[PDB]
Each structure stands twice: as C-alpha cells, then as structure tokens.
Subunit: 466 residues, 4 copies
C-alpha cells in the first residue's frame, strides 16, 4: 504494498509536474508585453493628423478612415533611414515584405423594400452574410483591387469579428515597399471610389521581425461598416516565435518535451489496462475521471505542437523573395490555440494535486468538506440560478438597445457578475431608463443576498439536523 504503490505514484506524478513546469517556464518568454505595447501605442494612439485629435481606437466615418490610411498609418510604418529601403520601425523592427488591404462587399438589391417606401428609396444593402456577398467587378477594373478573388486563390481563412464572421475572400491590393508609391496607390484608391455604400469590412495586414529577441509580430487591423452607418475598429496584435534551436536551452527544452511525451505515453498505457474487468466501474470518484481529461489534453497539445513545427520551413519560403506578402495568419492562430491548450492542461495538472495530500490525516477534513457540504449546495442552488437568468433576460429586454453592457445577452451575465462584485456604472442605467433602472438595480442587489443568506441558513439547519 500500500505504501510503496502510493509513494511511487506520488514521485512519478511529481516528476511529471516538474517536467511540465520547466516546459512552461522555458516556452513562456519574459518582457514580451512591452513589444506589443509599443506596437499598439505607435499604431492606435497617434492622431490620424497633426491638426486632428482622432486616432484609430475612436473612428467615426469613412473620412476618418481615409485620413488614417494615408496619415498615421503611413507615418508609423515607413521609417526614413537610420543614420537602402527596408523601414526599420523604431530602428530595429524590419517590416517584412509589403502590407495588404482587403475589403468585403454585399450586393445591391439584396433586401425586401416595403412597397410604401418604394418611391423615395431605390437602393438597399443587407447585413453581411455568405449569401449576400458580392462577387462582381466594379469601377475601373484595371487590376486586382476591383476583381473578386476566391478564398482558395487568396491564401486566407475566416476571421471572427465584432459584428459577424467574415469569409476571407474579396478585393485585395498589395501596397508598396516605400512611402511614395504606397501613398500614390492609396490616393488612386481614394480617387476612384473604392469604399462606397457596399463595403462591410476592411482588413490591413503586415508583419515585423525583431532581431534583438527572436520574435515575429502579426498585425491585423479590422474596420467594420455596419448596415446602419459608422465604423467599428479592431486591432488584435499577436507575437510569434518561428525560429527555434538557436541556443542550448532550446535543445534542453526539446529533451524535456520528448521525456514529457514519454511520461504521457506511460500514463496512458498504465491507465488504459486498468479500465479492464478489474475496476471496470471507473467513471466515479472524480479523480479517475480527470486522468482521461489530462491525457486527452496532452495528446491534442502534442498533436498541435508536432503539426505546427512542420510548417516553419514550408511557409518561410518568403526568405527567397522579400517582395510579396508573407502570410502568417495560420501560425499565429495555432500559437494562440497551443497556448490556450497548454494553460488549461497545466491548470488541471496543478489542481490534481489534492488527490495525494488527502491520504494523510487530511481525509477527515477534505472528505467531509467535499462530500456532505460540496454536494448539498449543488442540490438547492438553482433558485439563485433561475432568478439570475430571469434577471439577465429582463435586463437584456429593457436595456441593451441604449447601454453597451446589456447588448449581446452574455454581456448581461458578465455585467451582473460585475455588479455583484462591485463594479457599478449606475449613471448610464439611470440615464437610459429612469424608472425600471433603479428598480431593477435595487431589487437585484436585495434579492441576491436575501436568497443567498436564506440558503446558508438552510444548510446550517440541515447540518444541525444531521
């Protein structure tokens, strides 16, 4: 044995945990936040013009977008020279290739205009959708900025924005490597009207490479044009690490990764043979059910890691010709996915530690606390739950067309959580509705704590009657 088996399990789990911790510490670099901070400050906070005070974070119309495209964007992208034409941003960022600008359009007459308003209005444009997307040339064709390009010819993917989800095809244009030619191209796009009443989205893409610390950065600025009017901006900066095996620490990380997958295989093989006739009722105790989540997450993480390391050479064929657009979107997407999976896996492995500390005299504490008390809350706690969702629905129906925090129903849930915690924005609620606002606020705050106190009392009495 009893003692030897549990000690062996404890020591092997400790080795697995320390290996995983070394992996996470090694892969997670330090002082990376300031790189993205400087990029975002340069591209989103500088005013679009010297006389104006408008920036990218607060855009209002197509005129502002045009002022930004030929203004603050060109100033912060093409740096003159340090003491060749390679545009070292901040003097060591080395803008890679050329940027690209792409738009998405919809079809005219994709609506059902009421017959009453048939003499005053003769054009309509639906909200963005795959069925309403436009695929015809417009304006002076004369190139690729006025001709639809399919999602397969244009090596892209689907980007999920604030309003809707966008396909990834459309009308694109590759800008130039210098300031003058790019400015001329943008002026030509502005002259021959490019954004006119049919545009529903616009993307700007480029990448930089910092030599002092090996990291790439992909910038994807998105401006959405709703069917009502105005614009909605989004930036989404993201760093990358493509080149590996540069220092001895990288080979040490490779070694710890391979022994880590060895531990994963050892756990899965030692856990799959004991789901056999013996211990066949294996789906209980909440500890044996977690060891399958651990191995599933580890297997998918290993699959992503070995699928993401086989493309660092195929997609860096850009080193041969540094004149075209380097497409690095998929690499950033898989970085994000792998980081999320690794964080979830390490969180679960860390919280699995309770199963070993319970075998000491803690059983009378842990046991009782997690059995007689962590089980009867989950019985009668739906009363807090049903009234929470009822209040969320009431807030979404009353507010949500006037208050930004109450649109998009899930944000009602998040706003209610913040209100319970103490993050209150009562001015906007008061301004929106002067009667139901205060009533909703006071009734919610009163009844949540009322019912919580009630349930607490109930459980105390149940314990006293037990």
């Amino acid at each position: 044995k009893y003692l030897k088996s549990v000690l062996r399990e404890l020591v092997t789990y400790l080795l697995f945990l320390i290996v995983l911790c070394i992996l996470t510490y090694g892969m997670m670099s330090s002082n990376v936040y300031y790189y993205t901070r400087m990029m975002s400050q340069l591209f989103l906070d500088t005013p679009v013009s010297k006389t104006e005070k408008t920036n990218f974070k607060t855009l209002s119309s197509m005129e502002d977008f045009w002022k930004f495209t030929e203004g603050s964007l060109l100033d912060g992208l093409y740096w003159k020279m340090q003491p060749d034409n390679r545009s070292f941003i901040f003097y060591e960022n080395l803008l890679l290739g050329v940027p690209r600008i792409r738009q998405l359009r919809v079809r005219n007459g994709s609506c059902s205009i009421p017959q009453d308003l048939r003499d005053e209005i003769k054009e309509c444009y639906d909200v963005y959708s795959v069925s309403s997307e436009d695929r015809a040339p417009f304006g002076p064709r004369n190139g690729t900025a006025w001709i639809y390009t399919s999602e397969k010819d244009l090596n892209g993917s689907s980007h999920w924005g604030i309003i809707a989800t966008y396909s990834g095809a459309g009308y694109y244009l590759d800008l130039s490597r210098t300031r003058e030619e790019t400015a001329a191209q943008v002026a030509s796009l502005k002259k021959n009207v490019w954004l006119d009443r049919g545009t529903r989205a616009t993307f700007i893409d480029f990448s930089v490479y910092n030599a002092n610390i090996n990291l790439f950065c992909v910038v994807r600025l998105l401006v959405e044009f709703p069917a009502t009017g105005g614009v909605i901006p989004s930036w989404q900066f993201q760093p990358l690490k493509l080149i590996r095996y540069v220092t001895t620490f990288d080979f040490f990380l490779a070694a710890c990764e391979i022994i880590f997958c060895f531990f994963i295989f050892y756990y899965v093989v030692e856990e799959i043979l004991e789901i056999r006739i013996h211990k066949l009722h294996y789906f209980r105790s909440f500890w044996n059910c977690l060891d399958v989540v651990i191995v599933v997450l580890s297997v998918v993480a290993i699959g992503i890691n070995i699928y993401r390391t086989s493309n660092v050479e195929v997609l860096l064929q850009f080193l041969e010709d540094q004149n075209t657009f380097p497409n690095f979107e998929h690499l950033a997407y898989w970085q994000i996915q792998f980081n999320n999976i690794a964080a979830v896996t390490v969180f679960f492995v860390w919280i699995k530690l309770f199963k070993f500390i319970n075998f000491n005299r803690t059983m009378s504490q842990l046991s009782t606390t997690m059995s007689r008390c962590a089980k009867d809350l989950f019985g009668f706690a739906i009363m807090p739950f049903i009234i929470f969702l009822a209040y969320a629905q009431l807030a979404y129906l009353v507010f949500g067309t006037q208050v930004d925090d109450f649109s998009t129903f899930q944000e009602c849930i998040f706003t209610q959580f913040r209100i319970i915690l103490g993050d209150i924005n009562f001015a906007e609620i008061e301004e929106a509705n002067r009667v139901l606002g205060p009533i909703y606020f006071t009734t919610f705050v009163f009844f949540m704590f009322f019912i919580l106190l009630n349930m607490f009392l109930a459980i105390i009495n149940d314990t006293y009657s037990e």
Copy 2:
C-alpha cells in the same frame, strides 16, 4: 389522477413558456444598439464649433446653445449629397420631413418680490408650472414662432424632464428641408431675440428611417433653463418598428401571437372557474396569487399590442406629403411601454418555474427555506430598514446642496446602495463637508455590517433553540 394532472399542467406551462420565449426572441432585433450609438455619437459628441471643444452633453449658457443650433446641429443633419435634396445621414438614414423647435415661457411678475429689494430688481420669473405659463405674443408676431399654440392644436403630449414636467404646448417653428433656408431661419430667430430670460425649456425633434434594416428613430433633445441660470441638456434617442409583415418570419410571429392569446384565454378561463365555492380561499400559497398577476399583465400587453397596430396606417399619412413634420412621439412612447410590460411579464413567467420543480424530492429543501428561514427575516429586518432611511434622510439634509448624488432624496437611497456595494466617490464627500462627511461614511459602513452580523447571529440562535 394526481400524476396525470400535474404532468398536464407542466406540459401546458412549458408550451406557454416556449411560445412566450420565441415571441420575445422574434420581436427583439439584434445589433440595434449600434444604430442609436452612431446617432448619439454624431449628435452629442461632435464639438459645436471647430475652434471650440464644447459639445451638447456639456452645455453652459445660451451662447453655447445658439452656437450648437447653427453649428454642430446643422452639420450633422444636412448631408450634402452622396456621390435631389433628401439628406441621407451617414448615407443611409434619410431624414424624414423637417425638424421642429419649440419653447416654453413663463409670465413676468409671477413672483412676490420682497419690499426691501423693490428698488434694485423690477422683473421676476417663477419656476415652470402650468399656472405660471405664458400665453401672450411677443416680439415681432409675423408668424407662428411668436404666437402661443395650445396643446390640442399642436399635436403632442407632456414630457417628463429633469427639473419638471412640461405641458407640450408653446411657441414652435418648423425648419426647412435644406441647409441654407434652415440656417437663415435660425439666424432670423437669433437676431430678433427669441430666447430671453423667460424661456424655461426648448425641444428639438426629427426622425430618420434606415432602409437596410427597416427601423425608425425619433430624436428629441431637451434643454432646460432653470430660474437660477445655466442650461441642462437631455436626449431621448429611441428606435421604432412601424412596418411589419415584410418577411415570412413576421407571419410566423403573428401565428405565435395568436396562439399566445389562445393560451392566455385558456389559462384565465381555467383559473376563473376554480376560484368558485371550491378553493374559495384562493389568496394564499403565493402561487395562486401570481397566476392573476400573469393574466393581468398579459391582458394589458395584448391590449397595448392591438391598440398600437391600428395606428401604423393612420399616422403614416405623411407618405402622401413629405414636407411637414412627422409626429411619432406616441408610437415611441407605446413602444417603450409595451417593451417594459413584456419584459416584466416574461420575468414573472420565468420565476414561476419553481412550483413544478418543487414536486420532486426538492420539497424538503424549498420547504424549510421558505417556511422557517425566508419568513423570520421579514419579521426582524426593519432595524436595518429604519436606520437605512434615517441615514438617507441625514445624508439628504447634510449633503444634497453641494453633491449631485445626494440631491433628489431617492438618489440618497441609490447612493447608499452603491456605497454598500463598493462604488465610492469619497473625494466629493470630503470636499463638501470636512467633519460630518467622514463621520457619516464610517458610522454607516460600521453600523450596517454590525447590525447585519447581529441579525445573522440572532437567527442562528433561534434555529438552535427551535
């Protein structure tokens, strides 16, 4: 049965609930918040002049109001042309008809000036009231902007503003359909003094119609002139949906509405026959008392819905002549009322779910809680209540002339709730009173939790003695 009856009740209630939920989902459109957001940003955030930094949200005097009326208001209302005169705001809004501006005045000498100050002051003007309202012509009569018009001749109703409630009559002027004529009219109003020391309110009204998503928007901006001086601005951006039966989904929603009123009739008829000699003591158990609130709310909602659908054609006679002012205030008012009633009804229907989940083994949980614990708080909880209102009155008497959060006594209640939750603005309280401010704050925060803890202890002891 016993089982069959409760199962029948459960299934019919579930059908009613799903019908109500689908109705609410269908009627509540998506991404409506951005329409009002763009309107409000255009009209309330742009500076009144290029050199100035003052906007509508922060107005200070009549000079600022005059600068706004011929400045940012005209710029954001008349758009030049897209590539006729119809003024497509943001290129997709189509300002309907012409805007209207109206004011309310009071009579000179409606005061009782003290005999001591009788040689230095010879004019006085009371605060706004129906008895003090002015009804005489002034200045160069020459039209309708200088002649009183009754609330019956001028189609309108009262509006409940920040300081007082305004009748809805007064001196109005219909602006023009173009920028030049409207600017000339506003300049003529400014020259021959039209706002002079007697004005107590000013309204601006107009409407727009977005064709991409069929929705109207009624805008009314109210500027109040208190007897003390200065101005107070307000806004009531509210969307509308007048044209229906445009998509098959609308007819599906109509079918849902008719089956919903069928369920309402079925519930009321099955509930009114059983309030008879059998179960005559029907005003208890808190569940039978809720089913009458449900039917009352449903009946009033149905009445409002069928009264609001018979005027979508009578009041849209504006389509014949698009040169006058389209009056849509009542439609917006009834939209607001119907939305509030529907939200309350669905909230109550959702919280009615507890009576069916209780018939399973949950009765021993819900029982004690709402029979021994949710009742004895309501007995001894007035001590938290009396001292809460005493503190509110103390804060209203001490503060409230220096702090905006403590004027208008109900705001003392709301501020106390926010202080308990954790939203504190202690700087202004410290600045207002340097002695009673901190004393009140610390004593309130101490004593609230003191008495709460005390009551908790009391109830625990009562449970232990029972």
Copy 3:
C-alpha cells in the same frame, strides 16, 4: 393604566415626529443644488485664458493666480448688460456690493538657519502661525492694501483651511463695481509687487442674490501658499436664506416652529420630574439616556435659530448704501451649524422609534440580538481594532510622503475603510514602494477577513455552548 400610558406616549411622540418632519421639509428647499453647480462651473471650470487650459481647480504658481485674477475671474463676475451698472451674473444674479481681496504674510527672519548654510541663504520664512504673522507696512503704503488691519477693525473671523487656520486679519483691498476700474486696480497691485515670498494665504469674497428664488450665495475662494512652493486652491460655495415671511407657507412654518418648541418644553418638563427619587437610577436602558440628548440638541437648535433671526436686519444695513462690501460670512457659518444640528436631531428622533415597536411581540426578537448578541461583539472586537490602528500607523509611516491618501493620519483610516469596501488605487501604492506596498496590501486584506471570520466562529461556538 399600562395600555393607556403607552398609547399616550406613542401618540404624542408621533405628533412630535410629524411636526419635526414638516419643519424639515419646509425649511429644505428643492433644486438648490443647480444654483451652486452653475456658480462653481462658471468660476472654477472656465480656463484662466483663451489660449491656456488652466483653471482654478488646478493652479500651480503665482503667475497662474495673477492670470486668473485679471482673467477668468473678471470675465465671470462683470457681465456687460442685458439687452446702468449692476452686473447681473447669468442675467439674474445681481452681484451685491463690491468684492474684496485679502492676504496674510509672515515675518522675514522668523527661522533658525543652520550656520553651515549661512553664506548662500540670507532670507527665511516660517510656516503660517499667529506668532510668525507680519504686522508692518510694505511697499508703497499709499492706502489700505499695504497696511495691516486688525481682526477687530476688519469685521471677520478665522477660517480653517487645508494647511492651517488663518486669523482673519491682514492686508485687504476693496475692488470696484465695474470691470475697467477693477482691472486697473488689479494691474496696479500686480505692478507694485504685492504677493512676494511672504504671502501665506489669499482670500476672495463676494455675494449674489437671485430674485426668482429668494436665496443669497457667499463665495470665499482661498489660495494657500505653502512654505515649500506652489499653491493650493479652495472655493467653498454656500447658499443663504435671509428674507423670510414672504408667503403663507412661511407663517405656517413659524406656527410649526412654535408648536415644536411647545413639544420640546413639554418633553423636558415631563422628563425632569421623573429623574426624582422615583426612577432615580435613570442612566440605563439606553432609551432614557437618549431623551436627554434629544432635548439638549433641540435646545441648542432653538437657541441658534432665535439668535440667527435677530441679525437678518442688523447686518442688512447694506441696503442703505450699496457701494461697500456686504459681510455675510457669519450668517453662512450659522446656516451650516443649524443645518448640521437639525440633521443630527432628526436622525436621532428617527432612530428612537425602536422603543415603541418593541412592546408588541417583537420583544423576543431583540433580546438575544441586543441583550446576548449586540453585547458580546463589543467585548471581543478590540483585536480587529488594535490591528486596524497598527496598520493605519504603518501605512502613515511608510506612505504619506508620496501618496495623498496616506498623509494626514485620519486619511489613512478613511483609505483603509475604502480598501476594505473595495475602492482601490493600487497603482499609486505600487509606484511608491515596490516591496512594502504589495506586502502591506495583501497582508491587510488577508488578515482582516481572517480575524473577522475567526471572531464570527468564536461567537457562534459561544452561542452553542450557551
């Protein structure tokens, strides 16, 4: 009883309560906050110059003060004419008399300069105090702005500012009734240096009278010059109500006041004979000890009210000659004192309500809670208390020279209360000290709830053992 006596006490107490409520409602006017709001916005928020963006609320040096005195102050005080020289601020405020500006100085050589730094520095000026105050003429005497005037000759009293308390005497100058003469006087003061290295405070006083609602307003702007450098501003706006008996409601309130003092006499006489040989042990039960506080507060409030109504005519002799400075500071001070006393009295009267609701079957509710539970917290609660003051002292010693929230030791108490509630400003603490800041924050937040919960458990266990 027994019944008749308690019913008589209840009915007379409710009569007293309703009389007090009508008195307070009548004396407290409505919509007074906007008057002071407009005054403060006009005088504290407008930039000192058109090119500059500095206002009174954020002043930095003597140059800024000089720019404000001849800039935004003169613009917002002398209004040109409405369509005589009387300067109706906002067109109905009627600046009364002329404003006055006064300064306080200290003596040169009131220090003890170290002998080491005796060759580089030859002047010193102590912080403000009565012993260090200067009383000699300076500059070109030529009038009263360069000659000391005693606190008795100059009708005034002390004002308790931010840094210290100021005597109320000094060098004063009465400005003019028009813009040109006042500007010339301020320019002459600026030319012949009047604020020079010895000034420790500066006051600006004036008053206005609104005719639409009978109210005065006294403004006392204070700018402090610390011995280190810079300035600290303060404004302290305060309304007044001098003229009474103007409407019938005023006479109704007078009748309410006289019947109120009748009730006060009745209570004091009925309470004073029963502290006799019978019920001689009258200093217990917490209810008989409160009825003496009630009568003391009522007597002092009546004394203040009858002392403040006999000077509304003596000090309004300014109506005879409207060319000099109207001194209204004492009236505002007594308004503040009377309002504070009345608010405290009504709060105590409201919380006295518990003794009558207790004689019903509520008596068993409050025995344990006010006899067994409200007493044993006050026994073992000094551990929350001693560690609270120890933490306050630690925060005052560590911070307080870098953070504004931790200077002036009582503000450490207030900041700790706000931190417990949830109002955190962690950025400043992090910037101040990188080690003791976070340690103090986390340790305080952990240990406060640790000890509180522990005490709760102790109270429970004791109740279970009792």
Copy 4:
C-alpha cells in the same frame, strides 16, 4: 508575586511604547507630501513643449526624450532671478551644485543571429546585463561623455529599475550652473549622436534644499530603452534631513533615542538570562518568540541610525566647493531603509499589546477563538491556496502578453486580490481574449466563494461535533 511582576512588566512596556511613539512622532515631519507633490508636478506634468502635449510621464521615443531634455527640463530647473546665478526653484529651493546625466550601453554583436536571417540584418544588441555591457569609447572621444568610467571611480551603486537592475557605471556628463551653457552642452550631445541604438538606460540627477523647512530633495529620473523599442519613464522623489540639532526639540528627541536604547538593552539583557536552563523551551506560546524579533529589529535600526549619523559631515564637504555634483543617493537609500525598519518595529510593538489585555477575564474569549478556531483554518485552507496559484498561473499563461495587469507573475496575484475585492478592469480582459477571458473571470469568482463557503460550513460542523 504574581500581580506585582505582571504589573511591573505592563508599566515598563507602557513606558517603552510611549517612548517609541514620541520618537516616531518627532522624526515624522508634517506637510512633507506637498513638497514632493510640487516637485513632481513641476517636473513630470508640464508638457515638453508649448505646442506639444507630451510630458515625462508618457514618453514614446528618443525624439520625445530629446525634446524633454532641452525643453521642459531646462525650463523647470533654471529660474531666471527672483526680483547672481543660483536658480531658486519656485523661489525657495536653491538647486544644489550641477545636475548629471549618465547612460548605459551594450555591445554590438552580443547576439546569435539565425543563419537564415543573415543577409538582411547585420547588427544585434542583447538586453541589458553585466556580461553584455559596453566598455569602449565611441564617437568623438574629446572628454568624459564618450569614455567608460568604472563604478569605483564614479561614486555610485546599482539601481533597481523596471526592466532590469543597472550597474551604476557608464558614460556621464556634468551639466552647467546656468541655462545657456547647459543648453549648449545638450545641443552638442544631440548633434554628435550620443543615444544611438546601443543605449539601454539614462539617468538624470540633481538635488535641492529648502530653507524654510530644512529638508533636502534628491531627484532621479530614469528612462529605459528596451531591446524591443520605445522608452519607459521612471522617477523617484525622496526628501532628506541631514542637518539636525537645530531646535530644542531635536535634543529632546536625542534624549528619547538614548533612553530608548537603554530600554532595548534592558529588554535584551532580561530576555537573554531567562532562556537559560529554566524555561529552556523558549520557542513557543507565540509571545516569547516575538520578543526576539522586537530586539533584532531594534538592534538593526539602532545600527542603521548610528551608521547614518556619522556621514552627514563627511559627505557634506560639498559646502566647500559648490561647483561639482553632490552625491546624496546613499543617504536617501538609508533614509528609506531606516523608515521601513522603524515602521515595521512600531507595528510589531503595537500588535504585541494583546498579551497584557489577555490576563483579565478576556482569556475565555480567545480560548476557542485563538486555539480552537485560528488553528483549524490553517489546517484546511490549502485548497483556497492551491487553486489560487493555479488560477494565477493560468492567467499568467493566457494573459500577460497583452494586459499589463497580468505580466510579471506576482502582478497576477495582486490582480486576483483586487478582483476578489472588487476592482475590475473587465474591458481589457474582454478585448484580449474573447473566449477564455470571461470563462476565467466567471469561474474564478464562482469557485472562490464556493470553496470558501464550503470551508466555513466544514468548520461549523466540526465545531458542532467537537
């Protein structure tokens, strides 16, 4: 013993406590915060130029730093003359000596550039470290601003900045005593490029002395240049008190300090003979173990105090020649250390008071409370603890490259504490990650209170079963 011994201990402890309180009150001056506040307002809030709106607190590039160095820095440091060349800042500060500017550089080619990117990039510079530091002359040597100076020759020590810890040596330049010469020197530094792609830090140092209250102020301005790009400003204002024994109160404080060291010696001598064969088990009861912490802290504080008073004359040899740079960094460092030690010592002495109030009938209060309740929380509380650190690690892995609250892992702990208290910044978390952000927030807030409540219940049940 019994009574006499405990009374003697109580009275001697009271004497010690009052002596310590008098010492702390005497040493801690009043209204010191405003001195540093005015300095920081003058040097960090003024815009770098009249046309620009950028200040020191928000710097972005080397151009901004150059504009600040010859702009707002020179304006706020050299004041023209009061009605000699001594530059009385704010007219009472007397800038001491001359300021000094110093930089730190790294070596070119201190990287390992990948062989793939070997044709486009030919320079690299590692992050700051002692191994990568540059020690060679550059540019036109011609003086000491272009030649490395060791830490022993350049009197100084290391400083702990935001990104890393800097050595304290480098290339320095002593500015002039007047505005013109200093401006010329800064222009010459700007012309011959002095900050160029290798600079990793820059320091600015000076000091002032206020004669009205004898206090020095050392200002150190640090600007960090990360390898990624941009700048990170950092400041430090610290008052000093070098000259003592100026008033009689100083000699009284000296007497208090000496009698305090007599009390410390008496406590240590009476405590070291009691750890003898009698009561040799001295390391229990939590009271006997704290009296050694008290004496250790007191001894180290006395050592620092007597080591810091022997250099107030050695290092003030600058009085002989007021033309060079006065180095006062070590004095400020020891002020900070002594203040921290004294605050900790007085906090511990204050919280030690519980041992004397316990000998009255309070012993039963803290029996269960401090032996049965404060002990079993520390047993089963690691579940709140392990899941707290697991959540911190998850937040650091997911966020921390996009949100500044989650970089630098300890800030994850602090942000979690603030979130629990109620200080939420949910907009940034929502913008960074749209799926794991809300999930993490809601799950953390739910599970923390879930497990806390569970443990509370466990404790209650254990108490009831014991």
